[PDB]
Amino acid sequence: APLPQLRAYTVDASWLQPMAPLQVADHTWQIGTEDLTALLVQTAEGAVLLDGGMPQMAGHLLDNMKLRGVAPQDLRLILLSHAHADHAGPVAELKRRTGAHVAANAETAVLLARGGSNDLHFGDGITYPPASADRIIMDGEVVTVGGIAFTAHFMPGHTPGSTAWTWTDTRDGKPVRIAYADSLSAPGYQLKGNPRYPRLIEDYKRSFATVRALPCDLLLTPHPGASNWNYAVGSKASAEALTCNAYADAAEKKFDAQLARETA
Amino acid sequence: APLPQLRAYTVDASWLQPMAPLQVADHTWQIGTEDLTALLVQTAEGAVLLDGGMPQMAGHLLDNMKLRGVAPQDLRLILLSHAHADHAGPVAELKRRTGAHVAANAETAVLLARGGSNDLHFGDGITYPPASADRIIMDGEVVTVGGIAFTAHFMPGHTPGSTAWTWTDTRDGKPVRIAYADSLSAPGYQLKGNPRYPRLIEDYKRSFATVRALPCDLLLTPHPGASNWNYAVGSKASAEALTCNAYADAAEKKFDAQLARETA
Amino acid sequence: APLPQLRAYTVDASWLQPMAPLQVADHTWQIGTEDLTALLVQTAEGAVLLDGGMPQMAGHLLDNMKLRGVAPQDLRLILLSHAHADHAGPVAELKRRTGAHVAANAETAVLLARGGSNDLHFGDGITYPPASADRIIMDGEVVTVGGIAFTAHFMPGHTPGSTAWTWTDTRDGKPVRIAYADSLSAPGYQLKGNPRYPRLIEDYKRSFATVRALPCDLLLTPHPGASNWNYAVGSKASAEALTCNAYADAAEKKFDAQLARETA
Amino acid sequence: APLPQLRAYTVDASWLQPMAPLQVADHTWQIGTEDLTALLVQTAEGAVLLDGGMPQMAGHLLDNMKLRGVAPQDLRLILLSHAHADHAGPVAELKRRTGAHVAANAETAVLLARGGSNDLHFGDGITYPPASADRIIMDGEVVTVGGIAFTAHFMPGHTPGSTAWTWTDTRDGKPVRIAYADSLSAPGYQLKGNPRYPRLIEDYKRSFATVRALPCDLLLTPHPGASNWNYAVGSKASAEALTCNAYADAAEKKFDAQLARETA
Ligand SMILES: [Zn+2]
Ligand SMILES: [Zn+2]
Ligand SMILES: [Zn+2]
Ligand SMILES: [Zn+2]
Ligand SMILES: [Zn+2]
Ligand SMILES: [Zn+2]
Ligand SMILES: [Zn+2]
Ligand SMILES: [Zn+2]
């Protein structure tokens, strides 16, 4: 009876459905797939990328970028929410192919350096090509590219290095505060008494408060269904979107329900 | 007029005064120098090292270890307070020469990986040979070696990855709770409105509370004068030692005095 | 039409067939599977491991080690042939779980650091959890553990950092020179005019000469069928084994046949 | 008697004498100091940098670049000869400050990753801030930036990852083949019977042959005096320059004299 064959990290078919670039604000675009968010901000001095999706989306991301007049050498910075396979996937390949720089915090960098291996909750179940972080950022550090300022908000929970990003764009003159909050989910995570993550509960609760008090007029999540976005219906994709309070308050209800269900 | 020559990181002569191993508890020893703490815990299954001092103390540390019947292949784990040149110095050389493993948190690992370069406050002024962290630990994670349990307490302040370590030894039967708290100093640090460290103030204040509520009967610091230790006077070196409350309360007074002196 | 799902690196069922430790010489053992070689040398001062197989063999390797009276903290060094998924697989997990040190050359280290990703010929097709090399070794460097000396012989071909290892054991007194030569195969490799590996041909030809002039009385390969070993038939597993000249001369014939078949 | 204070890596005052950009060919410039070569190639799609000098030249290099109409975000690639403190010094700082990518071979990358620490011949005597290599290149790999092709020629000797670079520029129409050969010196190196570098002799001799058979009409070295360049006398700085044959033949004479002087 041989040892078992390796299993591939398979996701839903909706996560790999390539969509055309959908505009979010004057300078913010969505270039990922139908249920995976990949954001591209076009500044005068280059382009910023936030997340990327699955590792096999590197070629799709480059197309959407090329459609927006952005050549590979124009992508200056790659910002991340958290470094899992379905979010920080093609980061290694995009660095090799575009000459961009990764800006992430320490806990995200160390995870990104080992390709998601030895995950606190998944182990080596999901694994993506490893990338290196080029700039270590702290909580509240402002990253400016082409005059657009990205401020980091640490929300340690899903991963130790989860980070929500805040920037201010425009909408034909009207400034629009954008918040890109990370997933507040705990899928299969052992919440109470976790040896790998001992302060997981307090970290989650403190993250719930963080997202509530965010400067935000329009919120986006790595998974659109978390913010009730619907990338498929084009323009009215942001209609039934949630607030910051509504998002963190809904996540907290599912977290308390998870912790109570775990006592039994 | 040429560009300026590099300056060597020079310290006080007391920091490099090699001292003989001085016993702290039944299983805890001090093997560093007169004003630099290097702790060695002798378990049944190997030896743990906490800090090491300046990079040029690697050969002195090995001697003291050999005096305590500890061969190079007997040092299993290296634990760190914070990864600066005068504390995590010979860590690279000790890994090459003893086959030990480094256990540090993410913020300490990333700093240890670039040899203290690009320090938030010192820049490239101090720089030591880089080492790699072999185990990433979280706040409150218990590291056990030979039945002796080390629990990590994060005190982000001096460095983002500052860590106080707690273990329980004996004293001819009587169990003695030991706490190795990191420096709570801010030498030349810009406290108010630091762009590299924006949440420095709240991080310091939260560290002050952490050290107060530590399980501790005998406290040690990387610099003995911080805990009013006097490694020179041998046995009575722990006489006038401070408490946890007294240490963090004294550091907080000097921090508030520093922040107020900084407004002017 | 969604983007394609990731494919798992699946191997033959014979490669994952766990076998009992089979003795090769007085101090050399085989602890891998039926068609994957994992060698364990038991010295007076610790145990050396050469290769490991697929990443999912970490738990099987520990069993065989425990059967040979070798505790996890007794494995001092991990030596590698080349750093592919089916050979350097569980190296990350074994470091975390045994406190061993990896000794590999630069080209093997850099590949091992990115988990086989961006392979010159496979790309991201095969990928294993990344590990870090703790000692960089040169061509002809002698690694000694417990009085047993391992000398490295670089054979750049299959991978840039391919390495054959030579050590001298015993056989009830009679010294036996052992050579562990790496695979000399080029499965699907583009030999003529490769942009990623331009000097591939000369490197292969020079490797063919290297293996011929090896100090060797008994040869082993990462794949037993390459040396005509038959781990299944226990004691007579080394009966129809090949020589060094016969191995490199057979590989060269298949390489010239491959290069000529490639001109057409 | 305390342990000795650290010593700073001090160089000659000529090595830090900032000079104005001196043109070498139509697209090649020298932007370093009087006796340290830092080359800048201006292509239509960005700028390439070869070497940089001492770590404290990062601010001087940026000035000369800004004088040549090259903004920090215009430097796309950093190529290296060998990764020592006086050559690959400001590479860490230039990556943080310009968003460039480092292209070096494996042996150069691993050295660059530990900041020159644990040098085969200098140990931790010289140490610079560590940088990370973004693209691993092989012997004979062509790197193209803005239509200008750089081909790598490995000359393992001074360091295991020594590399000479060849590109073809112009001189008001006339194409000029440029070769940037690494130092062929062995200052204090133990040539015969070196345990850290066992194949040092054959590696040097093979490097001597490599540089002779280089496509080169004008040669430059990291140290101008090695090629009898005189950056000080402006235009006639390339007058009494050596050939490829003359350079490698002169270095070989000093190497054989060194090895014979070493037998005694
Ligand atoms: Zn995730
Ligand atoms: Zn997710
Ligand atoms: Zn410090
Ligand atoms: Zn200090
Ligand atoms: Zn292979
Ligand atoms: Zn193989
Ligand atoms: Zn040098
Ligand atoms: Zn030099």
UniProtKB/TrEMBL annotation, chains A, B, C, D:
Subcellular location: Periplasm
Residue intervals of the Metallo-beta-lactamase domain: 35-223
Domain of life: Bacteria
Binding site for Cu(2+) 1: H82, H84, H158
Residues engaged in binding Zn(2+) 1: H82, H84, D86, H158
Keyword Transport: no
Chain positions recorded as Zn(2+) 3 binding sites: D86, H87, H223
Residues annotated to bind Zn(2+) 2: D86, H87
Gene Ontology cellular-component terms listed: periplasmic space
Main location: periplasm
GO BP, sorted A to Z: antibiotic catabolic process; response to antibiotic
EC number: 3.5.2.6
Catalytic activity: a beta-lactam + H2O = a substituted beta-amino acid
Cystine residue pairs: C216-C244
Protein's UniProt keywords contain Zinc: yes
GO molecular-function term, one example from the UniProt record: beta-lactamase activity
Key words of the record: Antibiotic resistance, Hydrolase, Metal-binding, Periplasm, Signal, Zinc
Protein family per UniProt: Belongs to the metallo-beta-lactamase superfamily. Class-B beta-lactamase family.
Protein name, entry field: beta-lactamase
Species annotation: Stenotrophomonas maltophilia (strain K279a)
